[PDB]
Amino acid sequence: AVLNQPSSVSGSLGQRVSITCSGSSSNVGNGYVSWYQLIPGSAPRTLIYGDTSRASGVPDRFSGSRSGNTATLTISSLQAEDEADYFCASAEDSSSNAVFGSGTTLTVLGQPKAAPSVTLFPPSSEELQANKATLVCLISDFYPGAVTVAWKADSSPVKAGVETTTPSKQSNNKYAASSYLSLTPEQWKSHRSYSCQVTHEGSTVEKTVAPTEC
């Protein structure tokens, strides 16, 4: 089976949010639910066990509670570090077949807005001497994480050969994204300039690189 969890919940910095963990009378009914935190790029971290007990190192702002066939994980005084995926888990009676929840992505709102800074790297000497050419557009230090990226060649739109990652959190809890434009050295040498156009909250930052001189 799978325990029912809300797909995603949101809370403001310094507030409290609760994540519900619904189940049947066999898994959560017996009632010893556990809670785990998955930060991308890190091993899962046990938060709560035995419904209420906090695991080793878990601050007191993480609490647990159960009511019949529904357990609840409450996080008070939300910090930006609390943005992660949360899963509940319970033993299905026989204590040999664990069941995890569908998962809940917690996003922390109320962070200061930040405009993106964009760096556009031309292909290097090494890559150009390998019959390859890739333009790398790195976007960092922006919030919220909703941007669009567009490439130009001599102010004419380019749609082919573009690969872009989804925004991801960085060290200072701001977002960063990357986009790439794969070319042949002939194409790179052909045009007079190339541009990476990043749009964030109605405004647009554009970086231009040229093959002529760097």
């Binding site: 017996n30 033993a91 664990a98 929840g101 760096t119 790398v136 991801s168």
Partner: protein, 227 residues
């Protein structure tokens, strides 16, 4: 308590995935070792566990393809997944589970205590390919009047993952490593960037260390500024 997963990161479809887990610093509460995996975009999935007495419990939806044995002498646990499909590509975790008695009747309570680092496994017929590493050199464009951005480009590798550090991990402040893009050719690429003070560009050498375990490849690319 330390748990280390070992095994292949690439397996061909229809083959058998074999994973080992070596534990160090076992305590008295570590009474069973279990296996959990997480496919991309899906929730955590329990696989099975085995206790000190040798009893094995399996996920009933997968027991026809799972086997879990242990070697307490070497302090190891092994997981085998037979006839793998692309639905079996996931990060496989080794775990120590605890069992504390609430007794008051025998009401028990189980939870995962320590999680392993996780081993990323990809099911595919494509061949392993080590990465080409090129430098993203800082120029008079990539400077921000005091800070300058530099990085390295890890191009065309398979399969995931690729880890990148800077100066053999001596440089961590201001580093960001982006997730990978899956090109049309079926190869992965990512970038690692770090912002440094502009003054140090002529006094501090910056070397990006790319590591690609799936092909046992390690690259140390030096990133020199553009003249």
């Amino acid at each position: 308590v330390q748990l280390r997963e070992s095994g292949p990161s690439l397996v061909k479809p229809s083959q058998t995935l074999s994973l080992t887990c070596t534990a160090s610093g076992l305590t008295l509460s570590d009474k069973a070792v279990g296996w959990v995996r997480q496919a991309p975009g899906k929730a955590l999935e329990w696989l099975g566990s085995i206790d000190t007495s040798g009893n094995t419990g399996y996920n009933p939806g997968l027991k026809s393809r799972l086997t879990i044995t242990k070697d307490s002498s070497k302090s190891q646990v092994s997981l085998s997944v037979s006839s793998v499909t692309t639905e079996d590509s996931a990060t496989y975790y080794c775990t120590t589970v605890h069992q504390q008695t609430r007794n008051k009747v025998y009401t028990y309570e189980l939870h995962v205590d320590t999680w392993g680092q996780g081993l990323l496994v990809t099911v595919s017929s494509a061949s392993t390919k080590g990465p080409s590493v090129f430098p993203l050199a800082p120029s008079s464009k990539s400077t921000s009047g005091g800070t300058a951005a530099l990085g390295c480009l890890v191009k065309d590798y398979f399969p995931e993952p690729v880890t990148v550090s800077w100066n053999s991990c001596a440089l961590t402040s201001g580093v960001h490593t982006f997730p990978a893009v899956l090109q049309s050719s079926g190869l992965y690429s990512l970038s690692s960037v770090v912002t440094v003070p502009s003054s140090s560009l002529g006094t501090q050498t910056y070397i990006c260390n790319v590591n690609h375990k799936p092909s046992n490849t390690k690259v140390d690319k030096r990133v020199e500024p553009k003249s």
